[PDB]
Design a protein around this ligand. Sequence first.
Ligand SMILES: [Cu+2]
Ligand SMILES: [Cu+2]
Ligand SMILES: [Cu+2]
Ligand SMILES: [Cu+2]
Ligand SMILES: [Cu+2]
Ligand SMILES: [Cu+2]
Ligand SMILES: [Cu+2]
Ligand SMILES: [Cu+2]
Ligand SMILES: [Cu+2]
Ligand SMILES: [Cu+2]
Ligand SMILES: [Cu+2]
Ligand SMILES: [Cu+2]
Lengths: 277, 277, 277
Amino acid sequence: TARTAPAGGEVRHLKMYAEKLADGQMGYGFEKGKASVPGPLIEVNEGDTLHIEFTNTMDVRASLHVHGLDYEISSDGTAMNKSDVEPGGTRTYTWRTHKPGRRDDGTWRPGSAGYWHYHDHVVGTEHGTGGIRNGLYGPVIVRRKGDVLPDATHTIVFNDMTINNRKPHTGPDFEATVGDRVEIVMITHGEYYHTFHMHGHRWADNRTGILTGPDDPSRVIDNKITGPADSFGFQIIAGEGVGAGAWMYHCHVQSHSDMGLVGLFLVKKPDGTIPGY
Amino acid sequence: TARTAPAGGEVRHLKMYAEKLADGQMGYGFEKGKASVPGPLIEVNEGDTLHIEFTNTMDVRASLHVHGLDYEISSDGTAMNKSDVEPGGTRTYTWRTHKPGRRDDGTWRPGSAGYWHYHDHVVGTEHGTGGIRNGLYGPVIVRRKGDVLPDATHTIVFNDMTINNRKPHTGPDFEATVGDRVEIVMITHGEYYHTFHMHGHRWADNRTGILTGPDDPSRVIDNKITGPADSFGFQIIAGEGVGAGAWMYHCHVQSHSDMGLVGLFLVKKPDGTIPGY
Amino acid sequence: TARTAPAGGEVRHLKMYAEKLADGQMGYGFEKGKASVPGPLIEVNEGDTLHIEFTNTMDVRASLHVHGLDYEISSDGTAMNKSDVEPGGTRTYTWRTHKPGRRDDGTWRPGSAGYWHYHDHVVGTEHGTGGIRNGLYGPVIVRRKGDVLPDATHTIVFNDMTINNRKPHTGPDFEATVGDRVEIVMITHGEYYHTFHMHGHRWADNRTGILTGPDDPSRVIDNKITGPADSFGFQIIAGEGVGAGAWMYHCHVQSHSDMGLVGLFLVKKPDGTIPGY
Ligand SMILES: [Cu+2]
Ligand SMILES: [Cu+2]
Ligand SMILES: [Cu+2]
Ligand SMILES: [Cu+2]
Ligand SMILES: [Cu+2]
Ligand SMILES: [Cu+2]
Ligand SMILES: [Cu+2]
Ligand SMILES: [Cu+2]
Ligand SMILES: [Cu+2]
Ligand SMILES: [Cu+2]
Ligand SMILES: [Cu+2]
Ligand SMILES: [Cu+2]
């Protein structure tokens, strides 16, 4: 039986930094000098609270803003609500999450579980256009009790005309072995719509990207249109029914793939070999 | 227990007008001189019939065309089917709705319930491009028996590079008190794709925007890509788990929010105060 | 009771050709000299295997690449994996499909069923941009056991600024009689997003486009945003609740319908007459 996420309700503490990178980008990190684009994955269970001690090491104001999770207005990360951070400053952002349940009026409160993301909201403009462009974005996963857990999680961000702010034709590539349970968090940012496509693999267009059983009527897809700040995720069994191979993933807008918004899902046999690669 | 929509089947009569507005726009209204952009909300129960006595008070041909609801071709509101209205003329449009049910072949007929809209189809071009641009659009809600009813309904229309044809940076803003059940009808028109986003709140990507219980696998989202003539709706509990605040809603295409396609969901405490606002 | 698809598991063999057309386009066909744009419909049952003996009759390299179905890397139809076809050459592509079922870890493997498509991947660029533009695309339907079968299937492809590569304002038009069960396969290709809309009809936004019964919460829609390589399908009862008529279907992006990306769903009475047409 597959590993599943247990019941949440833990108070978690975390440090985060925003940093200017040597190449002109901006990234988040859990440690000073280890900022990355995309920023590090934040993964919690429904019911967890997260207190993020956020330090802005940059010479301009910056913030942390999160989609999907519960936060009071004092943690919304906007200039309007006095929620961003001065250069060199520190602020504790609090993100909460809740489980689904019956309200007293008999309606059903949805839980926080899903594939979400965080990003800056004040660099360049009051909607963080410059911060997002420079790399201040990262993924958030909230698990429901009983959600299937993967062997590994990869984050793919279509940010304007880049994947993960990389130069075109430089991937990123990811690797797995036939049979691995691989999780993809797929986020879009910027100005343009995209369509995310994976060769050789498919998933369900629902909350978890997988079906629980035969009663779920969700479309099974391998291609999905996205726009700025959309987030979704899914899991696949690497090579299931198709075998090892260099499986391309790309934006399917023809000029986007033509310019190099493409990467490789490298699915290996145990000996590491990939047929035709 | 929350208020729910009862079984439909009523024949309803309604007057509607299309009018040129003093500022050059065009709007629909239930009363001459009270046209609005967006036009007034039409809300019925599945099974209701609606006879709309429509008067075109303008100096150009205009029509009423509806998405989703049942109409015969004589009410489709197009020039092709001789269904538009001459200047100063009157025409009765008939919209019907039906409940879901079993067909005799054992398949399931879907009902009319959902978030829909109406708009002009002949001003400027034979697809109403000029009419839609000028403001001839409005929302339609069809309730299924047992659908949860809100405290209030707000209509948000991304029409080209405007919200509800307003100048950028002029909202609209909406207000609620913590705990209100607030309904949003979200319609898109024109030339451009958009992504609708709300701070501090989320909904289900399904027919009603809410989950009935734990078996619904729909994605819970706070960001949604839309294109011309898309319509969806949802309900939220204002401030649920997040408290009072000036909660922004905006298009998340970065240049769109930067140019001012943003508004405020003002969620107040009982004393009317909003923290940080 | 409606006709339904039986259990699959047949090995099927098929010949296909890619041909240059006299007008400069490129099309697939099951017979030399009978290539079409879109290419012919491939319809199988979950569990079927399809061996396609593909001949490239053109003077440039070409390939067959399929979405959704199972194929080994040797059938992915890309130059990278040595999977395309030299001018005048022949290659057997193998597509497999599987039924859903329980994995040994207790998770649910999704089946292949759905609305899919095939297209070239090497004409013009290594993502088939030139091949797709010229007409090398076609529909694939994989049926699950018990899926409702239609009276007829029509394929509508929004390819850049054309429907099915036709000149604007030339349809295509389709015909049915009131009460026919009509299936639509709706595919998008190229550079641009679109919104597909049908007058007088609606469907469910799920795998089959129809609801099985009252428990399915999928949105019922008549308008849907699509991007390059999206595919979906649905069935409607022609004229159900609305009667005979010339029912327009069009892209609802206003400049797209204005330029003529529109066609007619001609729903006739038994005597062939169409009111207002
Ligand atoms: Cu925002
Ligand atoms: Cu792209
Ligand atoms: Cu593909
Ligand atoms: Cu955002
Ligand atoms: Cu129309
Ligand atoms: Cu926008
Ligand atoms: Cu936000
Ligand atoms: Cu319309
Ligand atoms: Cu590809
Ligand atoms: Cu279009
Ligand atoms: Cu319409
Ligand atoms: Cu493709």
